[PDB]
Design a protein around this ligand. Structure first.
Ligand SMILES: [Fe+2]
Ligand SMILES: [Fe+2]
Lengths: 370, 370
């Protein structure tokens, strides 16, 4: 493959520069990196690589990757290639991938528009193969820059894989029979489509509300609040799937099932020994739904109530009432209220100032190894 | 076995009460639980079970497991059986085990004496099989009480298993050749011995210094400080192995290499996606030793410098200078100086107010899947 030879070259330059993360903005390093990229037999030919060579060579005057991001944002081809420095995606240094886009529903694209690219990865360099890396944001490039119109990529194939390896097993073990009838048996193409709906709604709703990101990003990075913000947009997405009639009914119900199953099960068990941000928010959802009549536990099995849509709306309304007070109180005050809400439904240890998995999900972690 | 039949009956009872942790102190519950225990054909005839039945039936007037803890503390036999509530050991409800004790160096037990029981689990009920549960503390029983002379059990067999599953392949991949000669190839009984030395020195030093636990336990529960406290006692153990001439030199050097390898490698990769309390402290040690001439990084591989003993003393002396100010400042100000010392040598994210794995160990987790 001509692609695999491009990537072998990237993977080889990746090994060479792995010890040099501190030099990634040093112009002496960059000049040589650019030269090695230019001298690459198959990679130096790619327009995107020439975009990066130019960007890198100019970095000392303009610390931007404008030519690479212009190539990517205009989709001049389906190749991504850059130098990355994302502290939560530590596998990424110099990386390359090729992708393919996914079908999108026309109404969804128009009414809930955002610069979102749900894609499958076709080939990639070693850093992209890490299971941590499920998305790629514009600030992940070394320049740390994001603009509201930069494309954000979600690697749907990794979400399909996680759904298959974790979520299906949890549906069988934890939900009452009939809980997710559309998702039962569904193939990868069906899951893929729902997943791509999910990320589109998810990104859209990040930008809506009274404390949207990125405007309020630095108030939403405390672990329980980052998780709560992910949950806020996913419940929004769930309710859109239930309420927007201009969405095809069969596809919208499928996506609803997908978002609910992911937030109720897969995210709820993430993190060892303590829950990560997504799990805290998911456990908040679990316990809120239990206490307010949206779900019921019969012998450690979850029954989704018929009133669940109304309890989800109630839940989002409550988050929106807390956030709404940004207009009359400080962002610090809303934060404390977002935390107080969270801690009422989660297992918060006040002395550690951190969270334990609620016992329901700790037992499932032990039971299923998830 | 008569023992197999006892545990079979415990597990079944465990299974009956699995949904009843909110009732573990209601007398109506304990009454029925006591009856079922008394009525177990094999379990009910164990002397330890007579004790539990008695403590439980009496719990309404005296909420403590006095007869159980007296039997255990007096080592009337090697059987442990109680009703537990330990929020960090969520698998423990009604649990039973039998243990065997280990050899023991007389100078160690005289000079560094504490009520420490390094034992191997021979048979156990299900909750004791979770890999989380490596020790049993007196406050893990439902009464929540700990006395200074209460026995503390360390399940050395689980520490052997972890060493062989994690530490050994991390030695091969991460350490310079010949870093831990006494550990290479060593059989399980050798590892067992060094581990039992480790836990005794560990427990003993918890009680030494200017901020011993349990007295100062609540000040040491923040995530970075619980780790730091664990590291303070293990460095002390490492130095005792190096400095105290009355310990057999073969067993002492072995134990030194064990503690150092556990602290430099296994504990340093704990936690996904974020480091747990042990890993934060281990990463503090790693970067401290790097910056102060104790270890060197030669081609991605750790070299232990000849000077490492002196740098270890330096490191413990630093911790002790911070804690010593408890005599002239508040416990909260010492906390802040302990936090500040930690964050200078670990990857603290001030907006999330949590820690990331330092890149050196992130790469290792990705590489070895640890
Ligand atoms: Fe998000
Ligand atoms: Fe300890």
């Amino acid at each position: 493959s001509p692609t695999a030879a491009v990537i072998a070259e990237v993977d080889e330059l990746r090994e060479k520069i792995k010890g040099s993360r501190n030099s990634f903005r040093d112009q002496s390093f960059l000049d040589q990196l650019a030269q090695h990229i230019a001298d690459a037999p198959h990679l130096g030919r790619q327009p995107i690589a020439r975009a990066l060579v130019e960007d890198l060579r100019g970095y000392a005057s303009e610390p931007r990757l404008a030519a690479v991001k212009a190539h990517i944002n205009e989709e001049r081809d389906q190749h991504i290639f850059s130098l990355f420095d994302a502290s939560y995606f530590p596998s990424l240094s110099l990386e390359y991938l090729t992708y393919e886009t996914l079908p999108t529903n026309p109404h969804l694209a128009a009414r809930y528009a955002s610069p979102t690219m749900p894609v499958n990865i076709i080939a990639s360099s070693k850093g992209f193969q890490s299971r941590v890396v499920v998305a790629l944001a514009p600030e992940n490039h070394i320049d740390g820059i994001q603009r509201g119109d930069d494309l954000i990529f979600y690697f749907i194939n990794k979400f399909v894989e996680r759904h298959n390896r974790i979520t299906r097993k949890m549906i069988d073990a934890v939900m009452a029979e009939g809980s997710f009838p559309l998702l039962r048996g569904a193939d990868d193409r069906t899951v893929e489509q729902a997943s791509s709906w999910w990320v589109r709604l998810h990104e859209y709703h990040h930008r809506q509300g009274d404390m949207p990101i990125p405007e309020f990003l630095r108030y939403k990075k405390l672990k329980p609040l980052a998780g709560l913000e992910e949950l806020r947009v996913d419940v929004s997405g769930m309710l859109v799937c239930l309420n927007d009639p201009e969405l095809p009914a069969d596809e919208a119900r499928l996506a609803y099932e997908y978002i609910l199953s992911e937030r109720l099960l897969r995210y709820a068990v993430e993190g060892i020994p303590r829950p990560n941000y997504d799990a805290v928010a998911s456990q908040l959802l679990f316990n809120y739904l239990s206490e307010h009549g949206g779900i019921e536990l019969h012998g450690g099995v979850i029954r989704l109530c018929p009133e669940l849509p109304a309890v989800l709306t109630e839940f989002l309304d409550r988050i929106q009432r807390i956030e709404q007070r940004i207009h009359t109180t400080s962002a610090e005050e809303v934060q404390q209220n977002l935390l107080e809400f969270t801690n009422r439904y989660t297992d918060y240890d006040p002395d550690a100032k951190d969270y334990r998995h609620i016992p329901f999900f700790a037992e499932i972690k032990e039971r299923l190894g998830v």
